[PDB]
Design an enzyme around this catalytic site. Structure first.
Site, short mmCIF file in Angstrom:
data_model
loop_
_atom_site.label_atom_id
_atom_site.label_comp_id
_atom_site.label_asym_id
_atom_site.label_seq_id
_atom_site.Cartn_x
_atom_site.Cartn_y
_atom_site.Cartn_z
N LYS A 39 11.85 -4.52 13.29
CA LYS A 39 11.42 -5.77 12.67
C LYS A 39 12.26 -6.12 11.44
CE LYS A 39 7.56 -3.61 10.22
NZ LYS A 39 6.15 -3.24 10.50
N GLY B 243 9.43 -10.80 19.79
CA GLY B 243 8.55 -11.80 19.19
C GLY B 243 8.91 -12.21 17.78
N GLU B 244 8.11 -13.13 17.23
CA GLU B 244 8.30 -13.69 15.89
C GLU B 244 6.97 -13.88 15.17
OE1 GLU B 244 10.44 -17.29 14.85
OE2 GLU B 244 12.27 -16.58 15.85
N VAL C 58 11.18 -9.55 15.70
CA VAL C 58 11.18 -8.21 16.27
C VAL C 58 12.02 -8.14 17.54
CG1 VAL C 58 9.63 -6.43 17.25
CG2 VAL C 58 9.02 -7.62 15.17
N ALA D 41 5.29 -14.85 10.74
CA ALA D 41 5.48 -15.11 9.31
C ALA D 41 6.34 -14.00 8.67
CB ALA D 41 4.13 -15.19 8.61
N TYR D 42 6.01 -12.73 8.97
CA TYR D 42 6.79 -11.52 8.64
C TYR D 42 8.31 -11.68 8.94
CZ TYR D 42 6.05 -10.70 13.66
OH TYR D 42 5.98 -10.86 15.03
N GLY D 43 8.64 -12.13 10.14
CA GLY D 43 10.02 -12.16 10.61
C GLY D 43 10.11 -11.95 12.11
N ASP E 265 -7.23 -4.88 7.97
CA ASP E 265 -6.92 -5.87 8.98
C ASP E 265 -6.84 -5.26 10.36
OD1 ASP E 265 -6.54 -8.48 9.87
OD2 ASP E 265 -4.42 -8.48 9.45
C1 LIG Z 1 5.56 -7.44 6.78
C2 LIG Z 1 4.70 -6.23 7.17
C3 LIG Z 1 5.58 -4.98 7.30
C4 LIG Z 1 3.62 -5.99 6.12
N1 LIG Z 1 4.05 -6.51 8.46
C5 LIG Z 1 4.63 -6.49 9.68
O1 LIG Z 1 5.82 -6.26 9.86
C6 LIG Z 1 3.70 -6.79 10.84
N2 LIG Z 1 4.23 -6.36 12.13
C7 LIG Z 1 4.70 -7.32 13.13
C8 LIG Z 1 5.07 -6.41 14.27
C9 LIG Z 1 5.64 -6.69 15.49
C10 LIG Z 1 5.89 -5.67 16.40
C11 LIG Z 1 5.55 -4.35 16.11
C12 LIG Z 1 5.86 -3.27 17.09
N3 LIG Z 1 5.86 -3.63 18.39
C13 LIG Z 1 6.16 -2.69 19.33
N4 LIG Z 1 6.14 -3.07 20.61
C14 LIG Z 1 5.66 -4.34 21.09
C15 LIG Z 1 6.28 -4.69 22.43
C16 LIG Z 1 5.66 -5.97 22.97
O2 LIG Z 1 4.23 -5.85 23.12
C17 LIG Z 1 3.62 -5.62 21.83
C18 LIG Z 1 4.13 -4.33 21.20
N5 LIG Z 1 6.51 -1.41 19.08
C19 LIG Z 1 6.53 -1.05 17.79
C20 LIG Z 1 6.22 -1.95 16.78
CL1 LIG Z 1 6.29 -1.40 15.14
C21 LIG Z 1 4.97 -4.08 14.86
C22 LIG Z 1 4.74 -5.11 13.96
C23 LIG Z 1 4.14 -5.09 12.60
O3 LIG Z 1 3.66 -4.14 11.99
#
Ligand SMILES: CC(C)(C)NC(=O)CN1Cc2ccc(-c3nc(NC4CCOCC4)ncc3Cl)cc2C1=O
EC number: 2.7.11.24
Length: 346
Positions: free
Chosen positions: A47, A25-26, A32, A28-30, A142
């Site tokens: 990410k 996915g994508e 993944v 504002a952060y960037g 949040d």
């Molecule tokens: C800039 C900062 C650090 C302040 N904010 C973030 O970077 C916010 N973001 C965005 C994000 C996307 C994915 C995951 C994540 N997604 C999975 N799997 C997915 C597989 C598909 O279905 C949904 C779960 N597994 C681990 C992680 Cl960490 C964590 C974050 C996150 O914290």
């Protein structure tokens, strides 16, 4: 051998430790991706963060990193690795490596009915992770279904600490209709009335909204804009009591509330006819209008709804409790560089 890997036209510069990238996915952060970690022999989440052009992305990136590196808890996502350039000058992006999770509670609620046993276990895990966060004097600020990650066996981890702050209850007061950053549908009523969201009760409200959304698969208070959110809340809770209204000293906020026609409380058991009665008693206590009367995390864990799980000796607290980052881009790049140094070869 190795080179700058691409995924959806963009450099995903993680190698050679992390191979066979698949896009997730994508935002504002960037961006993944998942990726095979060659050292632990696990697929992982990665990410890419590119914050260095703006103070606010720098602030949020630094908070997340500092908090998650200090925290260690089964119900809180950790940071396994951070990839970045060896010098401040060459560093344009940061990659944060975390355990791969199958799904999140937002995706799950859009597609799956939850059994009462699943609801109870998810709510247990959320509060257990929150007990730890609050014990470190941190507010998540949040909490929402998309920030609750789940694996294939339903272990739950809280993620995204970009909006987190150290608690500051003595400086919580503000005026009426003061702008706010966190996600609208999970905002406590007092945010729109007289609170900056610097007390632990802000998080309990959000957890209350999540519990309600687990009971019906639909958000409880789906406001379409800032003051519509308070419309929705009052629509269910009804008109605040004189006592609760008296605690709001600010005249613009108090007179707004007094201006509204009288509204009756909607009984939880009519809104959630299939729910466990103990779940609705705990929901009522989490969704209490007056934040001083709102249940705290440790009380919520001890609520009869959670009795099959409650075990305070197995609900740990932080050894080391903890904003002040209104700093320029350039000094925050340096703190992110210093905070990520432990993951470098050396
Ligand atoms: C800039 C900062 C650090 C302040 N904010 C973030 O970077 C916010 N973001 C965005 C994000 C996307 C994915 C995951 C994540 N997604 C999975 N799997 C997915 C597989 C598909 O279905 C949904 C779960 N597994 C681990 C992680 Cl960490 C964590 C974050 C996150 O914290």
């Amino acid at each position: 051998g190795a080179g700058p890997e691409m995924v959806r036209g963009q450099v995903f510069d993680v190698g050679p430790r992390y191979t066979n990238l698949s896009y997730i996915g994508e935002g504002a952060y960037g961006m993944v991706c998942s990726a095979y970690d060659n050292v632990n022999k696990v697929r992982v989440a990665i990410k890419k963060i590119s914050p260095f052009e703006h103070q606010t992305y720098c602030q949020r990136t630094l908070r997340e990193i500092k908090i998650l590196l200090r925290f260690r808890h089964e119900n809180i996502i950790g940071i396994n690795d951070i990839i970045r350039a060896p010098t401040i000058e060459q560093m344009k992006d940061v990659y944060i490596v975390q355990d791969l999770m199958e799904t999140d509670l937002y995706k799950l609620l859009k597609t799956q009915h939850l059994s009462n046993d699943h609801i109870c276990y998810f709510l247990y895990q959320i509060l257990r992770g929150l007990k730890y966060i609050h014990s470190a004097n941190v507010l998540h600020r949040d909490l929402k279904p998309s920030n609750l990650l789940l694996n294939t066996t339903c272990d739950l981890k809280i993620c995204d600490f970009g909006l987190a702050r150290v608690a500051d209850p003595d400086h919580d007061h503000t005026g009426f209709l003061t702008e706010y950053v966190a996600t609208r549908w999970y905002r406590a009523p007092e945010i729109m009335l007289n609170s900056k969201g610097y007390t632990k009760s802000i998080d309990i409200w959000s957890v209350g909204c999540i519990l309600a959304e687990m009971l019906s698969n639909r958000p409880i208070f789906p406001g379409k804009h800032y003051l519509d959110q308070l419309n929705h809340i009052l629509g269910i809770l009804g008109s605040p009591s004189q006592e609760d209204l008296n605690c709001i000293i600010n005249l613009k906020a108090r007179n707004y509330l007094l201006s509204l026609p009288h509204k009756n409380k909607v009984p939880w058991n009519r809104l959630f006819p299939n729910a466990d009665s103990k779940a609705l008693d705990l929901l009522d206590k989490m969704l209490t209008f007056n934040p001083h009367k709102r249940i705290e995390v440790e009380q919520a864990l001890a609520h009869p709804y959670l009795e099959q799980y409650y075990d305070p000796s197995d609900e740990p607290i932080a050894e080391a409790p903890f904003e002040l980052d209104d700093l320029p881009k350039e000094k925050l790049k340096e703190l992110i560089f210093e905070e990520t140094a432990r993951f470098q070869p050396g």
